[PDB]
Design a protein around this ligand. Structure first.
Ligand SMILES: *[C@@H]1O[C@H](CO[C@@H]2O[C@@H](C)[C@@H](O)[C@@H](O)[C@@H]2O)[C@@H](O[C@@H]2O[C@H](CO)[C@@H](O[C@@H]3O[C@H](CO[C@H]4O[C@H](CO[C@@H]5O[C@H](CO)[C@@H](O)[C@H](O)[C@H]5NC(C)=O)[C@@H](O)[C@H](O)[C@@H]4O[C@@H]4O[C@H](CO)[C@@H](O[C@@H]5O[C@H](CO)[C@H](O)[C@H](O)[C@H]5O)[C@H](O)[C@H]4NC(C)=O)[C@@H](O)[C@H](O[C@H]4O[C@H](CO)[C@@H](O[C@@H]5O[C@H](CO)[C@@H](O[C@@H]6O[C@H](CO)[C@H](O)[C@H](O)[C@H]6O)[C@H](O)[C@H]5NC(C)=O)[C@H](O)[C@@H]4O[C@@H]4O[C@H](CO)[C@@H](O[C@@H]5O[C@H](CO)[C@H](O)[C@H](O)[C@H]5O)[C@H](O)[C@H]4NC(C)=O)[C@@H]3O)[C@H](O)[C@H]2NC(C)=O)[C@H](O)[C@H]1NC(C)=O
Ligand SMILES: *[C@@H]1O[C@H](CO[C@@H]2O[C@@H](C)[C@@H](O)[C@@H](O)[C@@H]2O)[C@@H](O[C@@H]2O[C@H](CO)[C@@H](O[C@@H]3O[C@H](CO[C@H]4O[C@H](CO[C@@H]5O[C@H](CO)[C@@H](O[C@@H]6O[C@H](CO)[C@H](O)[C@H](O)[C@H]6O)[C@H](O)[C@H]5NC(C)=O)[C@@H](O)[C@H](O)[C@@H]4O[C@@H]4O[C@H](CO)[C@@H](O[C@@H]5O[C@H](CO)[C@H](O)[C@H](O)[C@H]5O)[C@H](O)[C@H]4NC(C)=O)[C@@H](O)[C@H](O[C@H]4O[C@H](CO)[C@@H](O)[C@H](O)[C@@H]4O[C@@H]4O[C@H](CO)[C@@H](O)[C@H](O)[C@H]4NC(C)=O)[C@@H]3O)[C@H](O)[C@H]2NC(C)=O)[C@H](O)[C@H]1NC(C)=O
Ligand SMILES: *[C@@H]1O[C@H](CO)[C@@H](O[C@@H]2O[C@H](CO)[C@@H](O[C@@H]3O[C@H](CO)[C@@H](O)[C@H](O)[C@@H]3O)[C@H](O)[C@H]2NC(C)=O)[C@H](O)[C@H]1NC(C)=O
Ligand SMILES: *[C@@H]1O[C@H](CO)[C@@H](O[C@@H]2O[C@H](CO)[C@@H](O[C@@H]3O[C@H](CO)[C@@H](O)[C@H](O)[C@@H]3O)[C@H](O)[C@H]2NC(C)=O)[C@H](O)[C@H]1NC(C)=O
Ligand SMILES: *[C@@H]1O[C@H](CO)[C@@H](O[C@@H]2O[C@H](CO)[C@@H](O[C@@H]3O[C@H](CO)[C@@H](O)[C@H](O)[C@@H]3O)[C@H](O)[C@H]2NC(C)=O)[C@H](O)[C@H]1NC(C)=O
Ligand SMILES: *[C@@H]1O[C@H](CO)[C@@H](O[C@@H]2O[C@H](CO)[C@@H](O[C@@H]3O[C@H](CO)[C@@H](O)[C@H](O)[C@@H]3O)[C@H](O)[C@H]2NC(C)=O)[C@H](O)[C@H]1NC(C)=O
Ligand SMILES: *[C@@H]1O[C@H](CO)[C@@H](O[C@@H]2O[C@H](CO)[C@@H](O[C@@H]3O[C@H](CO)[C@@H](O)[C@H](O)[C@@H]3O)[C@H](O)[C@H]2NC(C)=O)[C@H](O)[C@H]1NC(C)=O
Ligand SMILES: *[C@@H]1O[C@H](CO[C@@H]2O[C@@H](C)[C@@H](O)[C@@H](O)[C@@H]2O)[C@@H](O[C@@H]2O[C@H](CO)[C@@H](O)[C@H](O)[C@H]2NC(C)=O)[C@H](O)[C@H]1NC(C)=O
Ligand SMILES: *[C@@H]1O[C@H](CO)[C@@H](O[C@@H]2O[C@H](CO)[C@@H](O)[C@H](O)[C@H]2NC(C)=O)[C@H](O)[C@H]1NC(C)=O
Ligand SMILES: *[C@@H]1O[C@H](CO)[C@@H](O[C@@H]2O[C@H](CO)[C@@H](O)[C@H](O)[C@H]2NC(C)=O)[C@H](O)[C@H]1NC(C)=O
Ligand SMILES: *[C@@H]1O[C@H](CO)[C@@H](O[C@@H]2O[C@H](CO)[C@@H](O)[C@H](O)[C@H]2NC(C)=O)[C@H](O)[C@H]1NC(C)=O
Ligand SMILES: *[C@@H]1O[C@H](CO)[C@@H](O)[C@H](O)[C@H]1NC(C)=O
Ligand SMILES: *[C@@H]1O[C@H](CO)[C@@H](O)[C@H](O)[C@H]1NC(C)=O
Lengths: 449, 144, 112, 135, 153, 147, 48, 53, 41
C-alpha cells in the first residue's frame, strides 16, 4: 500500500531533441539531384496529431538546414567528379564583336589550342557572353577567362540536368519529426497546434537568391520572420500568402557545337546563333507585385511602429551576389531586380501593366563561392522558356539611419542556406525513448526464502 | 508514431499503453522495406552515392536503437509484455510524492524530468536484484 | 598543479583600464566541455566576492567592465574604467581537480 | 543567504576544537560545502570539502588525518572538528557554499562508482579565527 | 573536480572470481554487450553523433559503420542461440540434456569452489559445438513436438 | 588427412522429408540463419576479419556492408513478426485462429504423412497475406481478452 | 666484433612501428565471449 | 633546439589554385640550427642505462 | 658554414600564357643535386 514497488513500462510517450541523419525519400537520366537514389516514398502517411501539448521551436537553431546545405554541396561534387576539365581553354584568345544586327554582349572568339599531345595547330571558333571574359592589354581584342587564374574549370556533364525535384526527408525508425501546424508563426517560441510525422512534406531544392521560387505558401496571410527585427544585421524572410507568376525566356535558337579537345574530352559551345539576338528577359504583373508589397508593408509596420518604408536596389557590385539569380533548366540567369524595388510606402496612397525585366546569362558559375572550383555550363540549343512562382522575399534592413524615421529594406541575404529555412521553419527532429519506470501499485510475485 | 498519450497524464496514458500495443513502426514497415530491399538491387547497381550512403547509415542507426531498447527488457527478466513488475522497493530517496499526484496531473514526459538522475541506478537495482537473485532461486528450488 | 599571478600590485586611476593575469601550470578543461576557473576579490575585513565564474560567465551583481578570457592553460581579466571602489585583493581558483588551489594573489589600488 | 561561523578562539598545540557553521535560506542538503583557510597576511588555502548528501569528503594533505568535517542536514549545520592542532594552524577559517549545486551522484553503469561533481563557490561567511600555541 | 563513490561491482569484476560467486554478476556483463559510451554524458554522445555525421563521406566513417555493424552481429549471434534454445533470457537456464562425463568428470566441489570461468572454459573448448547441438535437439525433440501433443485432445 | 563421422544431420538435410519428419531438425535449419561460417573455423574466420580490416576500398567494399546489414535486418524482421504473434520462443507456436477450409481441405493425414514443406508453400502461397493478418487479430484480441 | 669481447651499440632503429610500440607495450585487445555452459544438479522439468 | 629562422615568406604563382610557398629572404645572422643538451644529467642517464644493459 | 643555402634562378611558365617567368627562391643544399660536374646548375 504505502510500500511502493518499481514497475516498468515500455512504449511510453517520451521524446528528446536530438540530431540524426535525415533519410532521403521520393517518388532516363540521372540529374544533379539523383532522387532515384532515394527510397520510394510512403504513398499515404501516417501522420499524427498530438493532444494538449506545446513545443518550443527555433528556426535559427535547427540544424536540418545545415545538413541540407552540406548535402547539396556534396551532390554537386558527385555530378561534377566524372566530367571534363577545361584547363586547356585558359589561354589568351582573340575575339570580335558579333554582328548582332546588346552591342558586344556576345562575342565570336577564336583560339589556337593544341588538342592532341601531337604537334598541332588548332584554330577554333566559340561563342561567349561579356560576363565570361576579361580583356587583355587595354584597347585590344585579346581575352582570357574570368576564373582561370585561381580556379579549375569543370564542364558540367551534358547528359546531367539541373531538374529540381521534390525531396522528402524521413526519420529513421526510433526518430520522429515534430511539426508545428499552428497557423501563423514567427519562427521562434512555443507552438500549440503540434502534430508529428514520419517524414517531411516535399521540398524542392533550388539555387536562387533574393526571390524564393516555387516554395510553399502561407495559409491565410503574408508573414514576416527575422531572428531579431531590431538587429539589422539579421536577415528577413517573407513568405507570401499567394504566389506571383513570373515568366522568363531566351528568345533565340542556338546551334550546339562540340570541340574535341582530347580523349573523352568533348567541350561544348554554341556554333551558331539562329535568328536575331534578342535579350533574355522575364515578365511580371505590375499590379500583382504592387499589391503584395502593400500587404508586406503593413506587416513591416506592425513590426516597426509607423515609419517610412522604403524599397531600393542593393549596393551594387559583383553580379553573383548583387543581381537576382536563378538556374533555369541548366542555364543561369541574372536579372536587374531594381525594377521591383524602386518605391516607397510611407503612408496611404506608372508605365505599362507588366514589367519586362531583362537579364544576363553567365556560363561560368561560382556556386557557393568555392574558391578553386569553377563550373562551366554548356548551352542547350535555344528555345529557353520557364515559368515560376515567386513565393517569398529575402530582405535585409539598412544599417545605421538618416534620422528620418526611415527604414530601408532591400534585396539581400546572400547565404543560400536561408532558402532552406523558408521551408524548414515548421519542423523539428526528435527521438523517442520507449522505456520508463513508475511506482506501485503491483508486485513481482516471488517465492521466499 | 504512437505519441497520442503525450497529451494526457500518466494515469490515462497507462490505459493507452496497452492500446498502443502495435509497435511504433517497423514490423509492417519492415515488410514494406522488404519490397524496397528487392529494389536495393537497383540501388546496388547504382554504385556508391551520397544519399545511398546516408541510407545505409540510417538503417544501421535505426536497428541499433531498436536492439538497445529491447536488450534491457531481456536482461531485466521482464521481456515483454508492455507492462511488467519487479521486486525493487521504491527507495524514497529518489522521490517522495503522493501516488495521486504521480499518476494524476502528471504529464508522463514532464515526470521524466525529475527521474533522470535516478534512472541509472534504478536500472542497476532491477538487474542485480530482480534477475541476479531470482534466477538462482528458481535453480536453487530445482536443486531439491 | 600550481597557479601564479601578475602583477603583484597594480596602481590605476579612476576611469583607467587595467588587467589581471593568472596562469596555470596545468590544463584547465573540465570533462563537461568547459574550464574550471573562477575569479574574485576581497577588501580588508571582507570576504571573497565571486566576480566571474567559468571565465566569461560573469556573476550576477557584477559590472560589465569586468571581462576575461584565455587559453586552455591560462586566463586573464580585464577591467575597463576601473572605479575608485575597485581596490583590494584579487585571486583566481582552479577547481579542475583536487586539491583546490589558488593563484598568488594580486593587489589592485589607486595611483596619485 | 545566511552564512555564519561559530566556535573560534585560541588553544594550545595538541588541543582540539569543533568549529561549526550555521546556515539558512536554502535547501542545505543539496549544497556541497567548503572550508577554506587564510593565514594572517597571506593568501587563501583550501582545507576541506563535503558533499551535499554528506557522504563524500576530502581533505588537504596538511590536515588530512587531523581534521574531520561532518554535517547535519536537518539542522543546517557544518561541523569542522580539528584535532591535534599545530602552531602553524593559526589562521582564519571560513565556511563557504558551492556556487553550482550538484544533484545526486551520477552513476555510470561501466563501473562508475557514483561520481560527485564539485564546482566553485559563491557565498563566503564572515569567518573566524583559530589561534594555536601555548601562551 | 570530481569525487568518487563505490562499487557497484563493475565491468569484468568477477573475471578472477571463483565461479560460484562469479555466477551472480551476470547482470554486469550482459548490460554492456552494446556500449563503452554509457550514460548521456552528455558531450560524448554529441561528439560521436557529430563525427558519425561529418565523416559519413569518408573511409573513417565507413570504419565506424564497420565496427558498429560488427557489434550488432556479435550480439545477435548470441541472442539467436538463446532464442533457439528454450532459454530466452533469463540470465541462466537449465536443459534436459544430461552431462556427459566424457567431456569432464571433475567434481562440482572443485568446479564451483576453485576454478575461474576461463580455466573452466579451457577445458570445454573442444566440446562446445557438440554440447550446443545436443541442447538444440533436446529442445526440439519432444520438449516441443510432444509439448504440442500434450495439448492434443 | 581428415576422417568423417556420423550425423547429426546438417543444413537443409530435411528437404527430403515429408513434413511429419520435418518437425525434427528445426534447430538445424534455423541455427545457421546468421552465418555461413558457423564456428571458429580456424583458417577462415581469421581471414574473414582480416578482410574487414581492408575496407579502405570504395564501392566494392561497401557492398559487403550492405549485405551484412540486410542480413541482420532480414533476421530481425522475422523476430519482430514472431514477437507480435506472441511466439517469442520458439520453434513451434500454436495460435487461436481456426483453419479456414477455403485455403485448403486436404486430409490432415495427407498433409503430415505425404507432403513436403516446399509443396505446402506452393499450395497456400496465395493466402499467406490474410493468414498473417488474422493471426495478428487473434493476438490483438487476446491482449484485451486476457485482461 | 667478438674479437675483443665487450658489447657495441649504435643508435639504430628500423621502423616507426617501434615508436608506437614504445607506448602501446602494455595493452591488449580482448574479445568478450559472454556465453558459456556448465554442469549443475538441476533438471528442466519438462513434462513427459 | 632552435633555428635562426628570421625569414619571410614568398608566394609564387604557378597556376590555377596553385600557390607556391617558399622563403623569400633570410634577414639576420645566418647560423646553423642546433640543439643544446645539459650533458651532466645526460651522462647520468647513460650511467643508468649501462647498468641495465 | 659554406654551401648551406643557394639562391636560384629558375625558369617557369606561369599558368598558360606566354610568360616564362624568371624567378627565384631559396633552397637548402640537402634539397638539391648538382648538374654537370661542379657547374652552378
Ligand atoms: C539532476 O541532473 C541535472 C543535470 O546535471 C548535469 O547533467 C548530468 C547528465 C550530469 O552530467 C551532471 O554531472 C551535470 O551536473 C542537475 O542540474 C543542476 O541543478 C542544480 C540545482 O539543483 C543547478 O544549480 C543552479 O545553477 C544556477 C546556475 O546554472 C545555470 O546557469 C548558468 C549560466 O551561465 C552563464 O550565465 C551568464 C549570466 O549570469 C550568461 O551571460 C552566460 O551566457 C552563461 N553561460 C553559458 C555558457 O550559458 C548555465 O551555464 C548553467 O548551465 C545553468 O543553466 C542550466 O543549464 C542546463 C544545461 O547545462 C539546462 O538544461 C537543458 O535545458 C534545455 C532547455 O533550455 C533542454 O531542456 C535540455 O535538454 C537541458 O539539458 C538548464 O535548463 C539550465 N537551467 C536553467 C534554470 O535555465 C544558479 O543560478 C542556481 O542558483 C540560483 O537559484 C536558486 C533557486 O533555484 C537561488 O536560491 C533560492 O533563494 C531564495 C531566497 O533568495 C529561496 O527562497 C526562500 O525560501 C524560504 C523558505 O524555504 C523563505 O520563504 C525565504 O523568505 C525565501 O527567500 C529559494 O528557496 C532558493 N531556491 C532553492 C532551490 O533553494 C540561488 O540563490 C540562485 O539565485 C541567484 O544566486 C546568486 C548567488 O549565487 C544571487 O547573487 C547575489 O544576490 C545577493 C542578494 O540576494 C547580493 O546581491 C549579491 O551581491 C549577489 O552576488 C542572485 O541574487 C540570485 N538570484 C535571485 C533572483 O535571487 C543553482 O545554483 C545546476 O545549475 C544544474 N546543472 C546544470 C548543468 O544546469 C540537477 O540538479 C540534478 N538533480 C535532480 C533532482 O534531478
Ligand atoms: C535510498 O537511497 C539512499 C541514498 O543512496 C545514494 O543515492 C542513490 C541515488 C545511489 O547513487 C546510491 O548508490 C547512493 O548510495 C540510501 O542511503 C545509503 O544507505 C547506505 C546503507 O544502506 C549507506 O551506507 C552506509 O555508509 C556509512 C558511511 O561510511 C563512511 O563514513 C563512516 C563515518 O560516518 C560519519 O561519522 C561521523 C562521526 O565520526 C558522523 O558525524 C556525527 O554526526 C552527528 C549528527 O548526525 C553528530 O554531529 C556527531 O557529533 C558527529 O560525530 C557522520 O554523520 C557520519 N556520516 C554518515 C553519512 O553517517 C566511516 O566510518 C566509514 O569508514 C565510511 O568512510 C567512507 O569510505 C569511502 C571509501 O569506502 C570514502 O570514499 C573515498 O574517499 C577518499 C578520500 O578519503 C577519496 O575521495 C576516494 O576517491 C573515495 O572513494 C569516504 O570518503 C569515507 N567517508 C568519510 C566521511 O570519510 C557507513 O558507516 C555504513 O556502514 C555501517 O553498516 C555496515 C553494515 O551494513 C557495518 O558493517 C558498518 O560497520 C557500519 O556500521 C556503523 O559503524 C559505526 C562505527 O564505525 C557505528 O557507530 C554505527 O552505529 C554503525 N551503524 C549501525 C546502523 O549500526 C554504511 O556503509 C550510504 O552511505 C547511504 N547513502 C548516502 C548518500 O548517504 C538508502 O539506503 C536507500 N534506501 C534503501 C531502503 O535502500
Ligand atoms: C595563336 O595561333 C594563331 C593562329 O591560329 C597565331 O596567329 C598568327 O601568329 C603569327 C605570329 O604572331 C602571325 O604572323 C605574322 O605573319 C606576318 C606575315 O607572315 C608577319 O609579317 C608577322 O611578322 C607575323 O609573323 C600571324 O599573322 C597570326 N595570324 C593571324 C590570323 O593573326 C598566333 O601566333 C598564335 N599564338 C601563339 C602564342 O602561338
Ligand atoms: C563566329 O560566329 C560566326 C557566326 O556568328 C561564324 O561565321 C562563319 O564563320 C565561318 C568561318 O569564318 C565562315 O565560313 C567560311 O565561309 C566561306 C564563305 O561562305 C567559305 O568559303 C568557307 O569554306 C567557310 O565556310 C562563315 O561564312 C561565317 N558566317 C558568316 C555569317 O559570315 C564564325 O565561324 C564564328 N567563329 C569565328 C572564330 O569567327
Ligand atoms: C491543428 O493543425 C492541423 C494541421 O497541423 C489542422 O489540421 C487540419 O484540420 C482540418 C480540420 O480537421 C482538415 O481539413 C479538413 O480536410 C478535409 C479534406 O481532407 C475537408 O474535407 C474538410 O472540409 C476540412 O478542410 C485538414 O485537412 C487538417 N490538416 C491536416 C494536415 O490533416 C487543424 O485544423 C488545426 N487546428 C486548429 C485549431 O487550427
Ligand atoms: C536584438 O539584437 C540586438 C543586437 O543585435 C539587441 O540590441 C541591443 O539593444 C540594447 C537596447 O537598445 C543595446 O543596449 C544598450 O547599449 C548601450 C551601448 O552599448 C548601453 O549604453 C546601454 O546600457 C544598453 O546596453 C545594445 O547595445 C544593442 N546591441 C547592439 C548590437 O546594438 C536587441 O536587444 C535584441 N533584441 C532581443 C529581443 O534580444
Ligand atoms: C525419401 O523418401 C522416401 C519415400 O519416397 C523415404 O522412404 C521411406 O522412409 C520411411 C522412413 O524411413 C520408411 O517408413 C518406415 O518403414 C518401416 C517399414 O515399412 C515402418 O516400420 C515404419 O513405420 C516407417 O513407415 C519407408 O519404408 C521408406 N520407404 C522405402 C521405399 O524405403 C525416405 O525417408 C525419404 N527421405 C527423406 C530425407 O525424407
Ligand atoms: C474462409 O474462406 C472463404 C473463402 O475466402 C476467399 O478465399 C480466400 C483464400 C481469400 O482470398 C478471401 O479474400 C476470399 O474471400 C470465406 O468465404 C467468403 O465469405 C464472405 C462473407 O464472410 C463472402 O462475402 C465471400 O463472398 C466469401 N468468398 C467466396 C469466394 O465465396 C469464408 O468467409 C472464410 N471463413 C471465415 C470464418 O472467415
Ligand atoms: C496596383 O497597380 C494597379 C494597376 O495594376 C493600380 O490600379 C490602377 O489605378 C489607377 C488609379 O486608380 C487606375 O487608373 C487604373 O485603371 C488601375 N488599374 C486597374 C488594373 O484597375 C494601383 O494603383 C496599384 N497600386 C499601387 C500601390 O501602386
Ligand atoms: C657526469 O657529468 C658530470 C658533469 O656534468 C661529470 O662531473 C664532472 O666531473 C669532473 C671530474 O670529477 C669535475 O671536474 C667536474 O666539475 C664535474 N662536474 C660537476 C657538475 O660536478 C661526471 O664526470 C660525469 N660522468 C660521466 C660518467 O662522464
Ligand atoms: C630563364 O632564365 C635564363 C637565365 O637564367 C634565361 O636564359 C637566357 O635566355 C635567353 C632566351 O632564351 C637567351 O637569349 C640567353 O642566351 C639565355 N642565357 C643563357 C645563360 O643561356 C632565359 O631567357 C629565361 N627564361 C625566361 C622565360 O625568362
Ligand atoms: C501606428 O499607427 C497605428 C494606427 O494607424 C497603430 O495601430 C500603431 O500602434 C501605431 N504605431 C505607433 C508606434 O504608434
Ligand atoms: C498617413 O496617412 C495615414 C492614412 O493613410 C494616416 O493614418 C496618418 O495619419 C497619415 N500621416 C500624415 C502625416 O498625415
Amino acid at each position: 500500500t504505502e510500500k511502493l514497488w518499481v514497475t516498468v513500462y515500455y512504449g511510453v510517450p517520451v521524446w528528446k531533441e536530438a540530431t540524426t541523419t535525415l533519410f532521403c525519400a521520393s517518388d532516363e537520366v540521372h540529374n544533379v539531384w539523383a532522387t532515384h537514389a532515394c527510397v520510394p516514398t510512403d504513398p499515404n502517411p501516417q501522420e499524427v496529431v498530438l493532444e494538449n501539448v506545446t513545443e518550443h521551436f527555433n528556426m535559427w537553431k535547427n540544424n536540418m538546414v545545415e545538413q541540407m546545405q552540406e548535402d547539396i554541396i556534396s551532390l554537386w561534387d558527385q555530378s561534377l567528379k566524372p566530367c571534363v576539365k577545361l584547363t586547356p581553354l585558359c589561354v589568351t584568345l582573340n575575339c570580335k564583336d558579333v554582328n548582332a544586327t546588346e552591342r558586344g554582349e556576345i562575342k565570336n572568339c577564336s583560339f589556337n589550342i593544341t588538342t592532341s599531345i601531337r604537334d598541332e595547330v588548332q584554330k577554333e571558333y566559340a561563342l561567349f557572353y561579356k560576363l565570361d571574359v576579361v580583356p587583355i592589354d587595354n584597347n585590344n581584342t585579346s581575352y582570357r577567362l574570368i576564373s582561370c587564374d585561381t580556379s579549375v574549370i569543370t564542364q558540367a556533364c551534358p547528359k546531367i540536368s539541373f531538374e529540381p525535384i521534390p525531396i522528402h526527408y524521413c526519420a529513421p525508425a526510433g526518430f520522429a519529426i515534430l511539426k508545428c501546424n499552428d497557423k501563423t508563426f514567427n519562427g521562434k517560441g512555443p507552438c500549440k497546434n503540434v502534430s508529428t510525422v514520419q517524414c517531411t512534406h516535399g521540398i524542392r531544392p533550388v539555387v536562387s537568391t533574393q526571390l524564393l521560387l516555387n516554395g510553399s505558401l502561407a495559409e491565410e496571410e503574408v508573414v514576416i520572420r527575422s531572428d531579431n527585427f531590431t538587429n539589422n544585421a539579421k536577415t528577413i524572410i517573407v513568405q507570401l500568402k499567394e504566389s506571383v507568376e513570373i515568366n522568363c525566356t531566351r528568345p533565340n535558337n542556338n546551334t550546339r557545337k562540340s570541340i574535341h579537345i582530347g580523349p573523352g574530352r568533348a567541350f561544348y559551345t554554341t556554333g551558331e546563333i539562329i535568328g536575331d539576338i534578342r535579350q533574355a528577359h522575364c515578365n511580371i504583373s505590375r499590379a500583382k507585385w504592387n499589391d503584395t508589397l502593400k500587404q508586406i508593408v503593413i506587416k513591416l509596420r506592425e513590426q516597426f511602429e509607423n515609419k517610412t518604408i522604403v524599397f531600393n536596389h542593393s549596393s551594387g557590385g559583383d553580379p553573383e551576389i548583387v543581381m537576382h539569380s536563378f538556374n533555369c533548366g541548366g542555364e543561369f540567369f541574372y536579372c536587374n531586380s531594381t525594377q521591383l524595388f524602386n518605391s516607397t510606402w510611407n503612408n496611404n496612397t506608372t508605365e505599362g501593366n507588366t514589367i519586362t525585366l531583362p537579364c544576363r546569362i553567365k556560363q561560368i558559375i561560382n556556386m557557393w563561392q568555392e574558391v578553386g572550383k569553377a563550373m562551366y555550363a554548356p548551352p542547350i540549343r535555344g528555345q529557353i522558356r520557364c515559368s515560376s512562382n515567386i513565393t517569398g522575399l529575402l530582405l535585409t534592413r539598412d544599417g545605421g539611419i538618416n534620422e528620418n524615421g526611415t527604414e530601408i529594406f532591400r534585396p539581400g541575404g546572400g547565404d543560400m542556406r536561408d532558402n532552406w529555412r523558408s521551408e524548414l521553419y515548421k519542423y523539428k527532429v526528435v527521438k523517442i525513448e520507449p522505456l520508463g519506470v513508475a511506482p506501485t501499485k503491483a508486485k513481482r510475485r516471488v517465492v521466499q526464502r | 508514431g504512437f505519441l497520442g498519450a503525450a497529451g494526457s497524464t500518466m494515469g490515462a496514458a497507462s490505459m493507452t499503453l496497452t492500446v498502443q500495443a502495435r509497435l511504433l513502426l517497423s514490423g509492417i514497415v519492415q515488410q514494406q522495406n522488404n519490397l524496397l530491399r528487392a529494389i536495393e538491387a537497383q540501388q546496388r547497381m547504382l554504385q556508391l552515392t551520397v544519399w545511398g550512403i546516408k541510407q545505409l547509415q540510417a538503417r544501421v542507426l535505426a536497428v541499433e536503437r531498436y536492439l538497445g531498447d529491447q536488450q534491457l527488457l531481456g536482461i531485466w527478466g521482464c521481456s515483454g509484455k508492455l507492462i511488467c513488475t519487479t521486486a525493487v522497493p521504491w527507495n524514497a530517496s529518489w522521490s517522495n510524492k503522493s501516488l495521486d499526484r504521480i499518476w494524476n496531473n502528471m504529464t508522463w514526459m514532464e515526470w521524466e524530468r525529475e527521474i533522470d538522475n535516478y534512472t541509472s541506478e534504478i536500472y542497476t537495482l532491477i538487474e542485480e536484484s530482480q534477475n541476479q537473485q531470482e534466477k538462482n532461486e528458481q535453480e536453487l528450488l530445482e536443486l531439491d | 598543479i600550481v597557479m601564479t599571478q601578475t602583477p603583484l600590485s597594480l596602481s590605476v586611476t579612476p576611469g583607467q583600464p587595467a588587467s589581471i593575469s593568472c596562469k596555470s601550470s596545468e590544463s584547465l578543461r573540465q570533462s563537461n566541455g568547459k574550464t574550471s576557473l573562477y575569479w574574485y576579490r576581497q577588501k580588508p575585513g571582507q570576504s571573497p566576492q565571486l566576480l566571474v565564474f567559468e571565465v566569461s560567465n560573469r556573476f550576477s551583481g557584477v559590472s560589465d567592465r569586468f571581462v576575461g578570457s584565455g587559453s586552455g592553460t591560462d586566463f586573464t581579466l580585464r577591467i575597463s574604467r576601473v572605479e575608485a571602489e575597485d581596490v583590494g585583493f584579487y585571486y583566481c581558483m582552479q577547481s579542475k581537480d583536487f586539491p583546490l588551489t589558488f593563484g598568488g594573489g594580486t593587489k589592485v589600488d589607486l595611483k596619485r | 543567504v545566511q552564512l555564519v561561523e561559530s566556535g573560534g578562539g585560541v588553544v594550545q598545540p595538541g588541543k582540539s576544537v569543533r568549529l561549526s557553521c550555521v546556515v539558512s535560506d536554502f535547501p542545505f542538503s543539496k549544497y556541497p560545502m567548503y572550508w577554506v583557510r587564510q593565514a594572517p597576511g597571506k593568501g587563501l588555502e583550501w582545507v576541506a570539502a563535503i558533499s551535499g548528501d554528506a557522504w563524500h569528503v576530502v581533505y588537504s594533505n596538511s590536515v588530512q588525518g587531523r581534521f574531520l568535517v561532518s554535517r547535519d542536514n536537518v539542522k543546517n549545520t557544518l561541523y569542522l572538528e580539528m584535532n591535534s592542532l599545530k602552531i602553524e594552524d593559526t589562521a582564519v577559517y571560513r565556511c563557504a557554499r558551492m556556487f553550482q549545486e550538484s544533484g545526486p551522484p551520477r552513476l555510470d553503469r561501466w563501473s562508475g562508482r557514483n561520481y560527485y561533481y564539485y564546482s566553485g563557490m559563491d557565498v563566503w561567511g564572515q569567518g573566524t579565527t583559530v589561534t594555536v600555541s601555548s601562551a
